[PDB]
Amino acid sequence: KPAWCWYTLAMCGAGYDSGTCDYMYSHCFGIKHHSSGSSSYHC
Protein backbone atom coordinates (compact mmCIF):
# COMPACT_ATOMS: atom_id res chain seq x y z
CA LYS A 1 0.00 0.00 0.00
CA PRO A 2 1.97 3.04 -1.26
CA ALA A 3 1.00 6.69 -0.95
CA TRP A 4 -0.72 6.28 -4.33
CA CYS A 5 -3.27 3.81 -2.94
CA TRP A 6 -4.99 6.55 -0.98
CA TYR A 7 -4.67 8.98 -3.83
CA THR A 8 -6.23 6.63 -6.29
CA LEU A 9 -9.03 5.81 -3.90
CA ALA A 10 -9.63 9.50 -3.20
CA MET A 11 -9.66 10.62 -6.85
CA CYS A 12 -12.12 7.83 -7.60
CA GLY A 13 -14.72 9.98 -5.85
CA ALA A 14 -14.48 12.55 -8.65
CA GLY A 15 -16.59 10.11 -10.70
CA TYR A 16 -13.38 8.62 -12.04
CA ASP A 17 -13.78 5.29 -10.17
CA SER A 18 -13.30 2.53 -12.80
CA GLY A 19 -9.90 2.67 -14.41
CA THR A 20 -8.34 4.37 -11.47
CA CYS A 21 -9.58 2.46 -8.50
CA ASP A 22 -9.47 -0.85 -10.35
CA TYR A 23 -6.16 -0.31 -11.98
CA MET A 24 -4.45 0.50 -9.06
CA TYR A 25 -6.71 -1.81 -7.01
CA SER A 26 -5.03 -4.48 -8.97
CA HIS A 27 -1.79 -3.38 -7.24
CA CYS A 28 -3.33 -1.89 -4.05
CA PHE A 29 -5.13 -4.88 -2.63
CA GLY A 30 -4.75 -8.65 -2.63
CA ILE A 31 -8.46 -9.19 -2.87
CA LYS A 32 -9.76 -8.00 -6.19
CA HIS A 33 -12.55 -10.52 -6.50
CA HIS A 34 -15.63 -8.53 -5.51
CA SER A 35 -17.32 -8.07 -8.88
CA SER A 36 -20.98 -8.92 -9.54
CA GLY A 37 -23.11 -9.47 -12.66
CA SER A 38 -24.71 -6.04 -12.43
CA SER A 39 -26.25 -4.86 -15.72
CA SER A 40 -25.22 -8.18 -17.34
CA TYR A 41 -28.72 -9.45 -18.06
CA HIS A 42 -27.90 -10.49 -21.64
CA CYS A 43 -24.14 -10.90 -21.37
**Residues near ligand NAG (CB under 6 A):** 18-19, 39-43
Q: How far is the CB of 6 from ligand NAG (least distance, A)?
A: 19
Cβ-proximal residue to ligand NAG, closest one = 18
Q: How far is the CB of 3 from ligand NAG (least distance, A)?
A: 22
Residues 28/8, Cβ–Cβ less than 8 Å: yes
Q: What angle do CA 33, 18, 28 make, to 5 degrees?
A: 55
List C-alpha distances in Å: 43 to 4, 6, 19. Answer: 34, 33, 21
Q: How far is the CB of 9 from ligand NAG (least distance, A)?
A: 15
